[PDB]
Amino acid sequence: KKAVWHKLLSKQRKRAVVACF
Amino acid sequence: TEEQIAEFKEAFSLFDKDGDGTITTKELGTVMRSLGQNPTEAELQDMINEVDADGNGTIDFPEFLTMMARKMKDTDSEEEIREAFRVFDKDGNGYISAAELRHVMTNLGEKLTDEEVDEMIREADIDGDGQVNYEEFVQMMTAK
Ligand SMILES: [Ca+2]
Ligand SMILES: [Ca+2]
Ligand SMILES: [Ca+2]
Ligand SMILES: [Ca+2]
């Protein structure tokens, strides 16, 4: 489902932001 | 610039679960656990403390902006998709395989089945070679 692909990209983006703290 | 401030507000809005304008250790912990991480309350305090500027123990948007300006100034939707593809493509051959997608899902705390993985590869795989290249990944990832 495209929603899950979108969700994984979003998770990777949030992981990258968490890494900035 | 206006484009990246917009970018960073969207990011902030992913963390500020209650929309009150502050990220707490509770909200940061919620986000980190959704990504399959297991932080302690001590790790979360240390992270909030590095970004906090007024010692109130929460992060407002101006404090978050300062962090992103120091750590991620250049990120756009485009640089983000390119970086995600590099992280997902574990063997660096330029194609995401079923096995690589399973690894990514586990690493980001996403429950999986083989049927779901097969459906995802098949739906993204425009040329029908059996794996997802960068062009295919961009086509799938452009819309939120
Ligand atoms: Ca909040
Ligand atoms: Ca603060
Ligand atoms: Ca690969
Ligand atoms: Ca393909």
Numbering used by the authors:
A (entry chain BBB): 1 to 21
B (entry chain AAA): 6 to 149
Cite, word for word, the article reporting this structure:
CaM is a highly conserved Ca2+-sensing protein encoded by three independent genes CALM1, CALM2 and CALM3, and all three encode an identical 16.7 kDa 148 amino-acid-long protein. The dumbbell-like structure of CaM comprises of four EF-hand motifs, each able to bind one Ca2+ ion.
We co-crystallised Ca2+/CaM variants with the RyR23583-3603 peptide to gain an atomistic understanding of the interaction. All the complexes gave clear electron density for four Ca2+ ions at the N- and C-terminal Ca2+ binding grooves. In the Ca2+/CaM-WT–RyR23583-3603 structure, atoms Nδ2 Asn53 and N Asn53 form a direct hydrogen bond with O of another CaM residue, Gln49. Oδ1 Asn53 also forms a hydrogen bond with Oδ2 Asp56 through the water molecule W1. For Ca2+/CaM, interaction with RyR23583-3603 is enthalpy driven and Kd is significantly decreased from 15±3 µM to 52±4 nM, as previously shown. Ca2+/CaM-WT–RyR23583-3603 binding showed favourable entropy, suggesting an important contribution of hydrophobic interactions, whereas the CPVT variants have unfavourable entropy, indicating a different binding mechanism comprising hydrogen and Van der Waals bonds, which can account for the measured reduction in affinity. The binding event is initiated by the C-terminal region of CaM and further completed by the N-terminal region.
